[PDB]
Amino acid sequence: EKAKRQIKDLLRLVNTVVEVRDARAPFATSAYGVDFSRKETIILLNKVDIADEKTTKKWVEFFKKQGKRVITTHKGEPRKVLLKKLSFDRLARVLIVGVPNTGKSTIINKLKGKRAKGIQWFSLENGVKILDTPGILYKNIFSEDLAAKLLLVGSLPVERIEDQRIFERAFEIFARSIGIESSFSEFFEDFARKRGLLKKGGVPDIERALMLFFTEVAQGKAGRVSFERPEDI
Numbered sequence: 001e002k003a004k005r006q007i008k009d010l011l012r013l014v015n016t017v018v019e020v021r022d023a024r025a026p027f028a029t030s031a032y033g034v035d036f037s038r039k040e041t042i043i044l045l046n047k048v049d050i051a052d053e054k055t056t057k058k059w060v061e062f063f064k065k066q067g068k069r070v071i072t073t074h075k076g077e078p079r080k081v082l083l084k085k086l087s088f089d090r091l092a093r094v095l096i097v098g099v100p101n102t103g104k105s106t107i108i109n110k111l112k113g114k115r116a117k118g119i120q121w122f123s124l125e126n127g128v129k130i131l132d133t134p135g136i137l138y139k140n141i142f143s144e145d146l147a148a149k150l151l152l153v154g155s156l157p158v159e160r161i162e163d164q165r166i167f168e169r170a171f172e173i174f175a176r177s178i179g180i181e182s183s184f185s186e187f188f189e190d191f192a193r194k195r196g197l198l199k200k201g202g203v204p205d206i207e208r209a210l211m212l213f214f215t216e217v218a219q220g221k222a223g224r225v226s227f228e229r230p231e232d233i
């Protein structure tokens with residue numbers, strides 16, 4: 001978490017920042033903590049393919065109204081369309097940054113292609129330079145809601161969660177966003193059974209159901225679902 005200080009070292013190399021956020025949770029996955037006010041910053045709302053389309057549009061409007069440079073994209077959107085959306089200035093030297101899991105390596109791979117002393121640049125056709133390694137932001141989780149949302153987008157591992165109320169919060173957010181009403185306890189006993197997750201004694205393994213469930217949610221395998229609205233639910 002302390003580097004951060006390293007993000008500052010990477011920032012000195014660049015004049016432009018692409019902040020890679022998950023469109024399902026744009027506040028939760030914001031790069032809060034690090035100062036980008038001296039750089040040209042683009043907010044990229046990634047993974048729109050597994051996000052609620054209505055909620056994503058509201059996020060775009062929200063950021064446009066804040067006077068912010070914002071685009072939306074996904075893994076399967078062509079390199080040409082992405083670059084057109086980004087529309088980098090001729091002098092751009094770009095750092096891709098974000099919290100874990102938001103799609104940064106995937107974006108670099110698309111940008112780079114078969115093209116290629118510390119971090120290296122690759123250049124676009126028009127000369128713009130992009131650092132070939134992303135900066136990864138680890139931020140302060142003070143709230144249960146922030147941890148729950150970072151869990152849902154796969155940014156924060158189940159292993160790192162020490163309060164069961166964070167699992168409950170995440171399930172509540174999920175359940176609301178998809179329509180479910182069921183108790184937490186009943187949902188995960190059932191999931192653990194439907195998936196063959198049994199401990200010794202043949203007891204449903206809730207720990208493993210949670211890990212697998214949230215891994216599946218993070219991957220978009222549990223519905224086209226968003227977890228935050230501008231908005232503010």
Ligand SMILES: Nc1nc2c(ncn2[C@@H]2O[C@H](COP(=O)(O)OP(=O)(O)NP(=O)(O)O)[C@@H](O)[C@H]2O)c(=O)[nH]1
Nearest residue numbers: 046047050074075100101102103104105106136220
């Ligand atoms: N549905 C969907 N999945 C995506 C998209 N972009 C990336 N993913 C998936 O999200 C996961 C994480 O992607 P990755 O590019 O490795 O993210 P990252 O930000 O580099 N990860 P980290 O910093 O934690 O290493 C992978 O399973 C990848 O396939 C997208 O637009 N849509």
